[PDB]
Each structure stands twice: as structure tokens, then as C-alpha cells.
Amino acid sequence: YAWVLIAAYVAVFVVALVGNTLVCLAVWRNHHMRTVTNYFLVNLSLADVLATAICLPASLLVDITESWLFGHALCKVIPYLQAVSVSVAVLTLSFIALDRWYAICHPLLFKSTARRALGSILGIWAVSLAIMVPQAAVMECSSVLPELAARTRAFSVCDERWADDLAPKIYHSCFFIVTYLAPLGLMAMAYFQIFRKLWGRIPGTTSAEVKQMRARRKTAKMLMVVVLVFALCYLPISVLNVLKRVFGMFRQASDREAVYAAFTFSHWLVYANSAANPIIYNFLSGKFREQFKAAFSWWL
Numbered sequence: 001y002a003w004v005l006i007a008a009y010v011a012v013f014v015v016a017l018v019g020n021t022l023v024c025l026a027v028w029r030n031h032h033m034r035t036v037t038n039y040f041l042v043n044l045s046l047a048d049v050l051a052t053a054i055c056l057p058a059s060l061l062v063d064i065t066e067s068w069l070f071g072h073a074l075c076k077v078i079p080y081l082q083a084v085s086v087s088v089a090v091l092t093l094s095f096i097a098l099d100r101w102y103a104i105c106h107p108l109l110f111k112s113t114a115r116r117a118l119g120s121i122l123g124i125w126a127v128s129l130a131i132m133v134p135q136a137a138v139m140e141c142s143s144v145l146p147e148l149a150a151r152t153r154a155f156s157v158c159d160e161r162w163a164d165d166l167a168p169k170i171y172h173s174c175f176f177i178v179t180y181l182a183p184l185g186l187m188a189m190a191y192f193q194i195f196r197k198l199w200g201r202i203p204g205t206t207s208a209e210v211k212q213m214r215a216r217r218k219t220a221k222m223l224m225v226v227v228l229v230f231a232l233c234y235l236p237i238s239v240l241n242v243l244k245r246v247f248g249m250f251r252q253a254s255d256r257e258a259v260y261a262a263f264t265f266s267h268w269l270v271y272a273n274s275a276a277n278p279i280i281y282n283f284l285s286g287k288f289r290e291q292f293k294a295a296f297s298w299w300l
């Protein structure tokens with residue numbers, strides 16, 4: 001099982017790095033690709049490259065070795081960077097939904113520009129880097145056998161140190177609602193209103209109006225799949241974290257092999273999301289597909 005786990009993580013690492021580099025290059029090299037949505041998709045690729053490059057290898061060895069092998073400093077930094085990546089991804093997806101919902105359902109309120117999208121992107125990172133400092137603060141690295149700590153990192157564990165039973169419950173309830181439930185629930189409702197608008201009806205609309213709607217239907221369909229795939233990828237880890245930290249589950253030693261398997265798969269699934277997003281754009285965006293086809297007809 002350990003080598004299938006290695007092969008799964010390695011496939012995702014390679015596909016996510018190549019795929020997300022291609023997303024950044026496509027938007028950067030082509031003016032026709034520089035849409036508000038594509039600026040936010042590049043930001044989602046930056047969040048996903050942060051998780052793929054630094055957090056994915058750490059999670060693979062923790063899942064295999066069942067120990068922390070990166071020292072005390074990295075015990076704070078790597079969990080922090082993973083929390084930052086999720087906050088960036090989910091706020092990026094939220095801002096795309098917000099942009100599309102305003103552009104489509106309430107067209108005359110706010111202006112949707114690339115410069116305003118870059119302003120939002122900076123704000124997303126500023127917020128995410130700050131709100132995830134409590135995660136870095138609670139991370140502690142400790143040996144199960146303190147006398148072996150000098151000799152080896154084999155019995156070293158990276159985990160959250162909580163001074164009371166109440167604080168982890170409030171924190172993990174807030175983490176779930178802020179980074180998963182409230183933005184996805186709101187995004188689901190936004191896309192349902194976008195769907196009703198784009199796939200309904202108004203006579204006497206111009207050539208530029210009719211063409212923009214056809215283009216919008218194609219993009220909205222793609223974004224709905226990205227949001228649904230994100231909701232599915234992050235659902236097992238969210239459920240497991242809430243069950244473990246809010247409801248005090250999985251503390252029995254008899255269940256440890258089934259618990260580790262469930263968390264190992266759930267951590268992998270989060271990383272599979274970074275590999276999924278460029279694959280979704282390839283199949284649901286003709287603009288990205290054309291770019292990827294040109295990249296692979298050149299590189300290979």
C-alpha cells in the first residue's frame with residue numbers, strides 16, 4: 001500500500017506543477033486570456049503551486065513514516081502554508097463567484113476590471129497570511145520518547161498544542177465555516193442565480209449581448225465544475241477534522257489503522273484538487289485547451 005501511496009502523490013505532484021505552470025503561462029503570454037476570471041484562476045494556481053511544492057512532499061512522508069522529519073521551525077511553517085493555500089483558494093473562488101454574480105445578475109453596480117481583480121488578489125493574500133497565524137502559533141513538535149529526540153526524528157510528531165479542551169473546538173468550528181461551509185454555500189447559491197439568468201429568457205438584445213451570453217454560459221459551466229470538484233476534494237478532510245477536533249472522535253488505538261487510512265486518503269484528495277483544476281480547464285475551456293495543445297506540441 002505504501003508504494004501505491006507514493007505513486008499517487010508523485011503523479012499529483014507532477015500533474016499539478018506542469019498543469020498550473022501552463023495556466024500561469026497561458027494567461028501571461030496571451031492578451032485574449034487576461035480576463036478577470038483568468039487573473040483569479042492564475043491566483044488559484046499560485047495557491048495550488050504553494051501547496052504542491054512545499055506541503056505535498058511533507059504530507060507524503062508524514063503519511064508514510066507516521067512522524068515529523070523536518071524539524072521544529074518547519075513544524076510551524078508547513079501547516080501554516082497549507083492553511084494559507086486553502087484560504088487563498090477558497091477566497092479566490094469566492095471572488096470569481098462575486099464577480100460573475102454582479103456582472104450577470106446585477107450588471108450596473110460595480111465595475112469588473114483586471115486592475116480591480118489584481119487589487120482583490122493582493123487583499124486575498126494579505127487576509128490569508130494574517131488569519132492563518134493562529135495555526136502557526138499552536139503547532140508544536142515533540143518526541144514520544146524524549147531521550148531519542150537527540151538521536152532521531154523517527155519518534156517526533158508535529159501537532160497542535162492546546163491549553164484547554166474548549167479552544168480547539170471553537171477554532172476548528174471557525175476554520176470549517178470560514179474556509180469551507182460559508183463560502184461554498186454562498187457560491188452554490190450565487191451559481192444557481194447565474195444559472196437561472198444565463199439559461200432563462202428578453203427580446204431585442206444586440207450581437208455583443210448574445211455573443212457575451214454564449215461565452216458566459218461556457219465559463220459559468222466551467223466554474224460550477226471547479227466549485228463542485230473543490231467541495232468534493234475538501235469534504236473528507238473537513239469532516240474528519242470536525243469529527244476529531246470538535247466531537248472528540250478517533251482517539252481509540254484499535255481504530256488507528258482505519259483512521260490513518262481515512263486521513264491519508266483525505267490529505268491526498270486535497271492535493272489531487274491542484275492536479276484537477278488545469279485538467280478541468282482543458283476539457284471545459286476551449287481557450288485553455290488551445291494553449292495546452294500548443295505547449296505539448298512544442299515541449300514534447
Ligand SMILES: CCCCCCCC/C=C\CCCCCCCC(=O)O[C@H](COC(=O)CCCCCCCCCCCCCCC)COP(=O)(O)OC[C@@H](O)CO
Pocket residue numbers: 094095097098101178181182183185186187189190192193
Ligand atoms: C467567509 C465567507 C466570505 C466570502 C463569501 C463570498 C462568496 C460568495 C459569492 C457571491 C455571493 C452571492 C450570493 C447570492 C445569494 C443568493 C441567495 C438566494 O436567494 O438563493 C435562494 C435559495 O436560498 C435561500 O432561500 C436561503 C437559504 C439559506 C441556506 C441555509 C444554509 C446555510 C449555508 C451557508 C450560508 C452562509 C451564510 C452566512 C451569512 C453571513 C434562491 O434564490 P431565488 O432566485 O430562487 O430567490 C430567492 C427567494 O425568493 C427564494 O427562497
Ligand SMILES: Cc1ccc(-n2nccn2)c(C(=O)N2CCN(c3nc4cc(Cl)ccc4o3)CC[C@H]2C)c1
Pocket residue numbers: 055056058059060062078079080082083086135175234237238241267270
Ligand atoms: C496535510 C493536510 C492537508 C489539508 C488539510 N486541510 N484541512 C482543511 C483544509 N485543508 C490539513 C489540515 O488538517 N489542516 C490544515 C492545516 N494543518 C496542516 N497540517 C499539515 C501537515 C502537513 Cl505534513 C502538511 C500540511 C499541513 O496542514 C493542520 C490544521 C488543519 C485545519 C492537512
Ligand SMILES: CCCCCCCCS[C@@H]1O[C@H](CO)[C@@H](O)[C@H](O)[C@H]1O
Pocket residue numbers: 069070071073074077
Ligand atoms: C519559507 C521557509 C522559511 C522557514 C525557514 C526554513 C529553514 C530551513 S530549516 C531546516 O530544513 C531542513 C529541510 O529538510 C531540515 O531537515 C532541517 O532539520 C531544518 O533545520
Ligand SMILES: CCCCCCCCS[C@@H]1O[C@H](CO)[C@@H](O)[C@H](O)[C@H]1O
Pocket residue numbers: 073076077080129130133136137138
Ligand atoms: C504575513 C505575516 C507573517 C506570518 C508569520 C507566521 C508564519 C509562521 S513562521 C513562525 O512564526 C512563529 C509564530 O508562532 C514564530 O514563533 C517563528 O519565528 C516562526 O517559525
Ligand SMILES: CCCCCCCCS[C@@H]1O[C@H](CO)[C@@H](O)[C@H](O)[C@H]1O
Pocket residue numbers: 165166169170171173174246247
Ligand atoms: C464556534 C462553535 C464552537 C462550538 C463547539 C462546541 C463543541 C460541541 S461538543 C460539546 O462541547 C462542549 C464544550 O466543551 C461540552 O460541554 C460537551 O460535552 C460537548 O458535547
Ligand SMILES: CCCCCCCCS[C@@H]1O[C@H](CO)[C@@H](O)[C@H](O)[C@H]1O
Pocket residue numbers: 172173174176177242246
Ligand atoms: C461548526 C462545525 C460543527 C457542526 C456540526 C453539525 C452537527 C452537530 S448536530 C449533532 O447531531 C446529533 C444527532 O446526529 C445530536 O445528538 C446533537 O444535537 C448534535 O451533536
Ligand SMILES: CCCCCCCCS[C@@H]1O[C@H](CO)[C@@H](O)[C@H](O)[C@H]1O
Pocket residue numbers: 238239242243247248249
Ligand atoms: C461536517 C462535519 C460534521 C459532522 C457531523 C457531526 C455529528 C456527530 S453527532 C455528535 O458527535 C459525537 C459522536 O459522533 C458525540 O460527541 C455527540 O454526542 C454526538 O451528538
Ligand SMILES: CCCCCCCCS[C@@H]1O[C@H](CO)[C@@H](O)[C@H](O)[C@H]1O
Pocket residue numbers: 255258
Ligand atoms: C479500494 C477500496 C478500499 C476501501 C477501504 C474501505 C475500508 C472500510 S474500513 C471501515 O470504514 C467505516 C467507515 O464508515 C468505519 O465505520 C469502520 O470503523 C472501518 O472498519
Ligand code: NA
Pocket residue numbers: 048089270273274
Ligand atoms: Na486546492
